[PDB]
Amino acid sequence: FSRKTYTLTDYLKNTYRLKLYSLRWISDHEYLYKQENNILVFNAEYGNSSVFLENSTFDEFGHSINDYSISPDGQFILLEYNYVKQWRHSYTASYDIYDLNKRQLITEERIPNNTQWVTWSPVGHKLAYVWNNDIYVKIEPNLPSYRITWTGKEDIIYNGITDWVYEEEVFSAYSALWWSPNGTFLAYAQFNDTEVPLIEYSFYSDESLQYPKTVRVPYPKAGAVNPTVKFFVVNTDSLSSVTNATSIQITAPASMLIGDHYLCDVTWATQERISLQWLRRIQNYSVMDICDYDESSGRWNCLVARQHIEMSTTGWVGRFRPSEPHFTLDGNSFYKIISNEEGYRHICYFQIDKKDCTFITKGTWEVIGIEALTSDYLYYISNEYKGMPGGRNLYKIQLSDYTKVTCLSCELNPERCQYYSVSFSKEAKYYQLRCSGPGLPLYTLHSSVNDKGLRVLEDNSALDKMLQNVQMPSKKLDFIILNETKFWYQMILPPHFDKSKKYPLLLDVYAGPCSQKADTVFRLNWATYLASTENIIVASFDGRGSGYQGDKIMHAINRRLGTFEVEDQIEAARQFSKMGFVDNKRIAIWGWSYGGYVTSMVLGSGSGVFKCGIAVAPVSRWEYYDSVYTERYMGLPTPEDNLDHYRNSTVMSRAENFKQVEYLLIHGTADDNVHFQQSAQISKALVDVGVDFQAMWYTDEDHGIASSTAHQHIYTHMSHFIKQCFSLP
Amino acid sequence: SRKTYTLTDYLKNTYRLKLYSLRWISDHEYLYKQENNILVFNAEYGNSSVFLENSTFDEFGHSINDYSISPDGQFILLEYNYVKQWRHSYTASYDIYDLNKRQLITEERIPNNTQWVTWSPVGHKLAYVWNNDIYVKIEPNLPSYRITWTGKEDIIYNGITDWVYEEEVFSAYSALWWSPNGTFLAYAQFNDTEVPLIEYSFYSDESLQYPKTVRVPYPKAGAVNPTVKFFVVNTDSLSSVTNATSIQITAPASMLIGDHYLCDVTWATQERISLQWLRRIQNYSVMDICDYDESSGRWNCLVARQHIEMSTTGWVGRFRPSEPHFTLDGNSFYKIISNEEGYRHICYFQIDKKDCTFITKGTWEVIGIEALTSDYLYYISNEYKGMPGGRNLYKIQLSDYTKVTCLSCELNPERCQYYSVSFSKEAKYYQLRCSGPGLPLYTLHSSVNDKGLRVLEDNSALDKMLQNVQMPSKKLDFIILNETKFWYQMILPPHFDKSKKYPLLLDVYAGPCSQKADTVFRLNWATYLASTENIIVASFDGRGSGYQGDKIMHAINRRLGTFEVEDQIEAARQFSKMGFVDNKRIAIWGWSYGGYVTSMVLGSGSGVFKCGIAVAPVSRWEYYDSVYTERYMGLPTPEDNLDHYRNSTVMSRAENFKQVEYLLIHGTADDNVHFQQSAQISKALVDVGVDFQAMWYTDEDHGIASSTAHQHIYTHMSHFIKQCFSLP
Numbered sequence A: 001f002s003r004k005t006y007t008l009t010d011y012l013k014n015t016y017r018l019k020l021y022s023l024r025w026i027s028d029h030e031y032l033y034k035q036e037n038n039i040l041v042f043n044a045e046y047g048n049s050s051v052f053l054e055n056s057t058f059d060e061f062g063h064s065i066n067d068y069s070i071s072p073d074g075q076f077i078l079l080e081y082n083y084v085k086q087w088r089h090s091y092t093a094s095y096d097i098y099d100l101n102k103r104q105l106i107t108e109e110r111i112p113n114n115t116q117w118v119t120w121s122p123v124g125h126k127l128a129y130v131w132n133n134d135i136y137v138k139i140e141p142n143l144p145s146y147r148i149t150w151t152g153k154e155d156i157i158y159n160g161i162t163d164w165v166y167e168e169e170v171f172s173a174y175s176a177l178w179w180s181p182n183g184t185f186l187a188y189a190q191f192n193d194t195e196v197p198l199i200e201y202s203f204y205s206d207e208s209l210q211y212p213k214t215v216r217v218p219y220p221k222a223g224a225v226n227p228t229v230k231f232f233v234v235n236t237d238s239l240s241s242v243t244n245a246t247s248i249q250i251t252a253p254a255s256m257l258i259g260d261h262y263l264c265d266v267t268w269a270t271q272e273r274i275s276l277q278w279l280r281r282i283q284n285y286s287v288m289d290i291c292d293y294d295e296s297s298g299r300w301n302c303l304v305a306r307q308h309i310e311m312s313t314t315g316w317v318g319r320f321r322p323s324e325p326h327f328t329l330d331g332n333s334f335y336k337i338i339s340n341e342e343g344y345r346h347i348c349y350f351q352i353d354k355k356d357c358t359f360i361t362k363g364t365w366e367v368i369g370i371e372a373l374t375s376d377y378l379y380y381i382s383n384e385y386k387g388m389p390g391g392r393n394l395y396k397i398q399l400s401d402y403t404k405v406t407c408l409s410c411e412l413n414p415e416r417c418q419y420y421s422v423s424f425s426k427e428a429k430y431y432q433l434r435c436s437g438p439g440l441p442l443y444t445l446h447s448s449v450n451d452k453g454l455r456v457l458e459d460n461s462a463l464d465k466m467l468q469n470v471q472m473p474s475k476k477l478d479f480i481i482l483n484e485t486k487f488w489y490q491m492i493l494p495p496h497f498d499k500s501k502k503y504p505l506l507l508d509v510y511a512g513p514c515s516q517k518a519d520t521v522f523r524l525n526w527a528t529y530l531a532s533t534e535n536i537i538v539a540s541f542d543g544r545g546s547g548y549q550g551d552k553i554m555h556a557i558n559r560r561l562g563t564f565e566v567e568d569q570i571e572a573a574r575q576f577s578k579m580g581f582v583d584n585k586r587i588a589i590w591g592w593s594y595g596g597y598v599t600s601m602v603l604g605s606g607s608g609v610f611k612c613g614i615a616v617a618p619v620s621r622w623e624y625y626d627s628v629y630t631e632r633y634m635g636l637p638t639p640e641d642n643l644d645h646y647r648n649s650t651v652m653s654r655a656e657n658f659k660q661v662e663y664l665l666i667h668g669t670a671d672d673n674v675h676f677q678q679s680a681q682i683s684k685a686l687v688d689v690g691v692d693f694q695a696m697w698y699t700d701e702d703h704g705i706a707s708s709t710a711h712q713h714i715y716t717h718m719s720h721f722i723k724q725c726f727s728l729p
Numbered sequence B: 001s002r003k004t005y006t007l008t009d010y011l012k013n014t015y016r017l018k019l020y021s022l023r024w025i026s027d028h029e030y031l032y033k034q035e036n037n038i039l040v041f042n043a044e045y046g047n048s049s050v051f052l053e054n055s056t057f058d059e060f061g062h063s064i065n066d067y068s069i070s071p072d073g074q075f076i077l078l079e080y081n082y083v084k085q086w087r088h089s090y091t092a093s094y095d096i097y098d099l100n101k102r103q104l105i106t107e108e109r110i111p112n113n114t115q116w117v118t119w120s121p122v123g124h125k126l127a128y129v130w131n132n133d134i135y136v137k138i139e140p141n142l143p144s145y146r147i148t149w150t151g152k153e154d155i156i157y158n159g160i161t162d163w164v165y166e167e168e169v170f171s172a173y174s175a176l177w178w179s180p181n182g183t184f185l186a187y188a189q190f191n192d193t194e195v196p197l198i199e200y201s202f203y204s205d206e207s208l209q210y211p212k213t214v215r216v217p218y219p220k221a222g223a224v225n226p227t228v229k230f231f232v233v234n235t236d237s238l239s240s241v242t243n244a245t246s247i248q249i250t251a252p253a254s255m256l257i258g259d260h261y262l263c264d265v266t267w268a269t270q271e272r273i274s275l276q277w278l279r280r281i282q283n284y285s286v287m288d289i290c291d292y293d294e295s296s297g298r299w300n301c302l303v304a305r306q307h308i309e310m311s312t313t314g315w316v317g318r319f320r321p322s323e324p325h326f327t328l329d330g331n332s333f334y335k336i337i338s339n340e341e342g343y344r345h346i347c348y349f350q351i352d353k354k355d356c357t358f359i360t361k362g363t364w365e366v367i368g369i370e371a372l373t374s375d376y377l378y379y380i381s382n383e384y385k386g387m388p389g390g391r392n393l394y395k396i397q398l399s400d401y402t403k404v405t406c407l408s409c410e411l412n413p414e415r416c417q418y419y420s421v422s423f424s425k426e427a428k429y430y431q432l433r434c435s436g437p438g439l440p441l442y443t444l445h446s447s448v449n450d451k452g453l454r455v456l457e458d459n460s461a462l463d464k465m466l467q468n469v470q471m472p473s474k475k476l477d478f479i480i481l482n483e484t485k486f487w488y489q490m491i492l493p494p495h496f497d498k499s500k501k502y503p504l505l506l507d508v509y510a511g512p513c514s515q516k517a518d519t520v521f522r523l524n525w526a527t528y529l530a531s532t533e534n535i536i537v538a539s540f541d542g543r544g545s546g547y548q549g550d551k552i553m554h555a556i557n558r559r560l561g562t563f564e565v566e567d568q569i570e571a572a573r574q575f576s577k578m579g580f581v582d583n584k585r586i587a588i589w590g591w592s593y594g595g596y597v598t599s600m601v602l603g604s605g606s607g608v609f610k611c612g613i614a615v616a617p618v619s620r621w622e623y624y625d626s627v628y629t630e631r632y633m634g635l636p637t638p639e640d641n642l643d644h645y646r647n648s649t650v651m652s653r654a655e656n657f658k659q660v661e662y663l664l665i666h667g668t669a670d671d672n673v674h675f676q677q678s679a680q681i682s683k684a685l686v687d688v689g690v691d692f693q694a695m696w697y698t699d700e701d702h703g704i705a706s707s708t709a710h711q712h713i714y715t716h717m718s719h720f721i722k723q724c725f726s727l728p
């Protein structure tokens, strides 16, 4: 007692750093690692390394290097510079190519300035880039590029890149280019936003700008005209300087052309077979096409008999979208995470020209991901171990006997490590395990043959020593029983926690569909500061709508957002208050985006449980949020469908009940995702009913509020608000 | 132990000031609206007749927003479907009711979404503007004649002003001027083709899925300004077959050299218009005098008749060149001009003679010329007891300029030191309007012997109510800064005690030619703060303030955010040195220019002010409109005054806000001081790591004047000031 604590300045200035081990596999036995601006090549088997690229090589380059991409064949390296961020994944940059053999920059036929995407072929040294929404291909870095599409037009026709909604909610990527495994075929999507309405907002820029700029983004809100999609494939081997490149269109199924549809997944099975998944605008019916190259005709035929249909009666298909297929090397079969009869997600074995699939996994738990596939074994992550949904462990199923299941991670360090992710080598000969809690992160390399522990890569020993000197908070992960169902919660407990003493409680909420805020992960965040320094219990709760516990829980919120997930956060806090170590006169709630929505809906409930709370960039009314995400859970806002609950599930309609609570409303003006609009309507509804509240806008900040200064400012302002709400010095 | 003047009393408007709004329709009669009845009153004897009974428009179907009766009392305009645009501009539907026939005009009705309507000054001719084009109706029932065809939304404005002309030049949407007999209709044409657009989000009702973007032609400081043309049309010679001929009056040669404004339009006679023009650099103004040639049908503006008004110390006029007051023949006029000593006084101009003769002199200013007869010119000034914040009606004998008589001074010198006036058509009777320091008092008088005829409204009903309330007193006095008198007021709490120490809120505006220390009686937020919370609300008139000579007003020329900021600090500093104020609890607040000066004071690092509130503040002068900014600052070029434009920003003083508690408030739909200005303040404070309170108001303009928003802002500002001064 009476020693150092984890301060707000420690969180903001990043005094206590987590070390990472970010490696990129270049073959079955070698990986690359960036260390003090030197790129090293490492041998997985023996552990030896050499300087692949010297940090001194690009000293007289004349530009600040943002990122590196080396060609699969290790002959060339892309230098990314002049990085200008757009949305979450999208950005623009200039690119130069450096010949490693010749040790010199390619000066002729250069990649243009303001390039939108670049990618190597997965083998060799071929480049496909996007510039002014049009796709270009280079066979050699030094030779001229071949233009593939001519239809590209800013904010209208997107060739090889996503529009706003496809980027954020479908592909989680700017890229809509897919090379074939050998690099013969370049598959691309085309998005058409002609009839899609624009979100318009002011961007104020530097002081020097006299007239504010208006930003105009094609953004389909709930029920609005969506973008249309086409899918094309091009033969890269037969490109001539004389003739234009011939792009063969793959049409979507007849069952999708009936109405509005999305292209939600693209996976190459072999060199001559593409898997395309399509999803109806009502996201309860999805169709997987298997499309084969006709070697004579030069076409792509997608037999109707080969189609695999995935549908839901209880809600929507998949966690966020239809799950990724993992093909056997021959491409005549694949593995896919599917919801079983009991509503739990498990691996299903599909054979191409045979009906149904065979479930290879079962039980009251879920497979999170399929990570690798050999002839002998399929490697997957799940939350099976100790029946803890918030835990993650790497498992291995013998394909010759599905009963032979081996945990590879569970017992490596069972007190320190209960949350693993994995990175396999090109043919899964070695894997990197990445532990992220409940102890400090631990990065370890393994051999697939015997599942032997080779090496430790990073153990965070330097950090461990420093945090021994600091009064750090403990993390309790447990459950409470509501209507005979286990629901999991966590509490960031202050140092030297005392069950006799009564503590003020902040409820940290997200609570979106398929979310998890009660897990075994180690975080140095704002909650650490609040517990360490200010002696606040920061609790999170996974109620109805939360993921990784079966559809019974996750689909409970179907067509009914801002109901059970709101009710359950109130009931969680109420049950925490009835525990002996919580001061029921000092219970707060805060969250971001969906967290902001649920925070606002709880404060507007009239429960009496919550004294104060903070909504950062909240959703206020579901008609204001994008089509793909909102319609997944709510359907369309028509009288025929679910308009009644769209209108019944707003923050604005609960304005009267904010008289009983102290509310802080925060939002960035340049939020391209949850538009400032949503907070603008909350504030106006509170003004209209005569409710006092604190507010704070952030000029030109997006959904992150992630600029160094803005990040420091919001957490400082939010700290002051929570401190004064709980009567703390 | 009586009740106090609460915040609820201010916001729900418990204690109402009664008015007496009259419109003179002749030399001896005025119109007065009472319980939705319009009455005609006889000025001499005081008897009345019901002109329009309130029951007449019960089955009309729409809510009537305003009434306008024709000069000849034969028709009445019914204004309904009122949709407000900017401060003066709005759109409405109009019906005309025939008083003779006792029936609504059913045929050839005024269009829906009409932008302006006005009667001829005599008879029953109507001129209206619709889709930015002027129309004329000779009879209400007959079809209208189209005058202009060039009108186009946001581009060509015929007969109506654009944004900047409305707000900063004419203080009116109307750019339409009839001749004294209804013969000629003069109009201005504004061209906003190359004027850049301010763009801001309007979120509207909850139901609207996609926010609207509002696009307004708005010239910021240094930007491309609107161009102006001036036309005159003969309404007597309008044909149903042939198009109407508009004769252009060209601006003087000294204005066409560069960028200019049309700043005043005044008919002298039936055959004469006076136009005033102002250069974009507002140190040079030209009055033109234009006569109708009956033979050619042209308007000729002889070069020798031109009158030039210029300033070396600053800008022309208080805000613009002053209006001329013509003698009945129109061969002479009177005009308030700055004299050799820098004080504003009446100057006698004869049309074909150079220069003018000064009729008034002294260390005080003429505010306005109110009426003109063959015998007397009636004017308001601040002469009485050498009080700049006092206003009184005077009368000067035109046959002997030494014979000056105060008509208002001695009517009730304890109750009334602030008068405005409304004369009848030929100045036979006048309504005096007292505004303070006591309750407002409305009295009618006869010009002949200056006899007090009648009391119209004395606010006796209010007097009774305020006896039950612990009301705050007002002290108006001065302090000595560099051997100069500068005036201040203080709203002192009830049962004020000079032995006890009180917290002080400094209420600031301090814009060029402003006055916040006066003798006017106000029931406002300051009344609540003094009555209930026992706070001294002080205001101070420093360098830049008006009605005290150019030496003071022009001290801030090309130097905004300097001396007016310094002097508010020094005023507060001197108030702290008084024994009855707590120097550890001094706050500052203001709106627009007040918000700018509040921000600049808090960013000074003086240590005088603990906290303050900037509502809809200007942050950088490059963000505010051309006409206002360039009047005081010149152009933002390296050639001119860009150095001080860049040195006079709130953003550059961000570091010093670490030492103070700052509340920054702004409406998102502010068309005047754009939300931009607060958006750049906030970003600069975040960028240098300064904590501050903030509050935006969705879809509120510069007023923040909607019932709910008004209640909310003053509640939020109350909570902030209370917690800053540690008040129960």
Ligand SMILES: *[C@@H]1O[C@H](CO)[C@@H](O[C@@H]2O[C@H](CO)[C@@H](O[C@@H]3O[C@H](CO[C@H]4O[C@H](CO)[C@@H](O)[C@H](O)[C@@H]4O)[C@@H](O)[C@H](O[C@H]4O[C@H](CO)[C@@H](O)[C@H](O)[C@@H]4O[C@H]4O[C@H](CO)[C@@H](O)[C@H](O)[C@@H]4O)[C@@H]3O)[C@H](O)[C@H]2NC(C)=O)[C@H](O)[C@H]1NC(C)=O
Pocket: A151, A157, A192, A193, A194, A195
């Ligand atoms: C991205 O997505 C948008 C739509 O969301 C799409 O733009 C649309 O393109 C179609 C097809 O080109 C347009 O419909 C055509 O319009 C023309 C006339 O164009 C003018 O008028 C329309 C409104 O009426 C405007 O929108 C447009 O801007 C122009 O001002 C019609 O003449 C076309 O009719 C033909 O097709 C019919 C059906 O086959 C025939 O029956 C008819 O006789 C016409 O025949 C012509 O085409 C035949 C093709 O087989 C040919 O055989 C004939 O000989 C003859 O040439 C047609 O209705 C639609 O208006 C556009 N909408 C919008 C909002 O822009 C983009 O093209 C798409 N972009 C990409 C790259 O995929």
Ligand SMILES: *[C@@H]1O[C@H](CO)[C@@H](O[C@@H]2O[C@H](CO)[C@@H](O[C@@H]3O[C@H](CO)[C@@H](O)[C@H](O)[C@@H]3O)[C@H](O)[C@H]2NC(C)=O)[C@H](O)[C@H]1NC(C)=O
Pocket: B150, B156, B191, B192, B193, B194
């Ligand atoms: C409102 O103001 C704008 C200018 O701000 C006027 O538009 C301008 O009109 C002139 C007319 O002389 C155009 O110049 C001419 O252009 C043609 C070619 O189009 C050329 O052949 C002629 O010799 C002459 O130079 C000018 O281009 C045009 N500018 C713009 C920006 O449109 C407009 O006429 C004004 N409208 C009214 C009703 O007063």
Ligand SMILES: *[C@@H]1O[C@H](CO)[C@@H](O)[C@H](O)[C@H]1NC(C)=O
Pocket: A036, A037, A038, A055, A056
């Ligand atoms: C570059 O590499 C050298 C040798 O490994 C090392 O000493 C130096 O710190 C590096 N330079 C940096 C980090 O700028």
Ligand SMILES: *[C@@H]1O[C@H](CO)[C@@H](O)[C@H](O)[C@H]1NC(C)=O
Pocket: A041, A042, A043, A046, A048, A049, A050
């Ligand atoms: C590792 O050692 C072997 C044998 O000396 C060598 O050939 C190989 O290049 C080394 N690998 C790396 C990555 O340096």
Ligand SMILES: *[C@@H]1O[C@H](CO)[C@@H](O)[C@H](O)[C@H]1NC(C)=O
Pocket: A094, A110, A111, A112, A113
């Ligand atoms: C990118 O911009 C710079 C600066 O204008 C220019 O020197 C360079 O040539 C441009 N890049 C290409 C590929 O043309």
Ligand SMILES: *[C@@H]1O[C@H](CO)[C@@H](O)[C@H](O)[C@H]1NC(C)=O
Pocket: A150, A242, A243, A244
């Ligand atoms: C390729 O197609 C485009 C039309 O989209 C055309 O401009 C171009 O001439 C074509 N190229 C050749 C070589 O024919």
Ligand SMILES: *[C@@H]1O[C@H](CO)[C@@H](O)[C@H](O)[C@H]1NC(C)=O
Pocket: A644, A648
């Ligand atoms: C709407 O919300 C109210 C209040 O939460 C609830 O009583 C009602 O059941 C909801 N459902 C419908 C269909 O209106």
Ligand SMILES: *[C@@H]1O[C@H](CO)[C@@H](O)[C@H](O)[C@H]1NC(C)=O
Pocket: B035, B036, B037, B054, B055
């Ligand atoms: C109409 O006028 C009479 C006085 O003539 C007044 O007493 C009455 O209240 C008025 N009614 C309305 C509805 O304004």
Ligand SMILES: *[C@@H]1O[C@H](CO)[C@@H](O)[C@H](O)[C@H]1NC(C)=O
Pocket: B040, B041, B042, B045, B047, B048, B049
């Ligand atoms: C006032 O009284 C006189 C005499 O009866 C009358 O002629 C006049 O019309 C009255 N005026 C009004 C406005 O009622």
Ligand SMILES: *[C@@H]1O[C@H](CO)[C@@H](O)[C@H](O)[C@H]1NC(C)=O
Pocket: B093, B109, B110, B111, B112
């Ligand atoms: C104005 O609109 C109303 C309907 O709102 C219509 O009855 C009327 O005819 C319109 N007036 C004119 C003069 O066009």
Ligand SMILES: *[C@@H]1O[C@H](CO)[C@@H](O)[C@H](O)[C@H]1NC(C)=O
Pocket: B149, B241, B242, B243
């Ligand atoms: C009046 O001028 C307009 C064009 O400005 C035209 O439409 C109309 O025909 C003209 N009428 C006559 C009689 O010249």
Ligand SMILES: *[C@@H]1O[C@H](CO)[C@@H](O)[C@H](O)[C@H]1NC(C)=O
Pocket: B181, B182, B183, B270, B271, B292
């Ligand atoms: C009004 O004055 C003008 C001056 O030109 C004249 O033409 C017209 O006849 C006069 N009208 C009346 C009604 O006296």
Ligand SMILES: *[C@@H]1O[C@H](CO)[C@@H](O)[C@H](O)[C@H]1NC(C)=O
Pocket: B643, B644, B647, B648
């Ligand atoms: C700028 O403003 C500062 C205010 O502290 C003043 O000291 C200085 O004299 C001014 N000079 C210029 C060029 O702004």
